[PDB]
Amino acid sequence: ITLEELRYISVFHSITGVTAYRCIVDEENNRLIFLVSEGEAGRAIGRGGRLIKLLREALGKNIEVVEYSSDLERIVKNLFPGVKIESINVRERNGVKQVVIKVSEDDKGAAIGKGGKNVKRARLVLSKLFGVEKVVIR
Question: What residue stretches are annotated with the K Homology domain (predicted)?
Fold first, then answer.
């Protein structure tokens, strides 16, 4: 937790009143991803996403909220809302963790997202939270 992330987390609570466990910085897309407790996402977003907007203005970046979970399958389902997750497989060899997410043939496209947008955000998040160095949609 860098001092920068610390600030981000501080402002998150000051604006929304909700506590952010972690804030994953995504410079490649000028985006901050706040991790909140189960069932707290709606409170963090606010009526009409008004809090998301105030945070964007306060922090100068696009804001995203995801509910944290120590359970991998759960947080994966949270990371891919628009898709149905059938199963996940964590393959570890020599300390290298790889995660294979199983979706339906049809849902496959939406899983990865355009430009792999979705698979990339997850890889970013699982990397910082679970040591996963690679995510794959199957």
Answer: 28-120
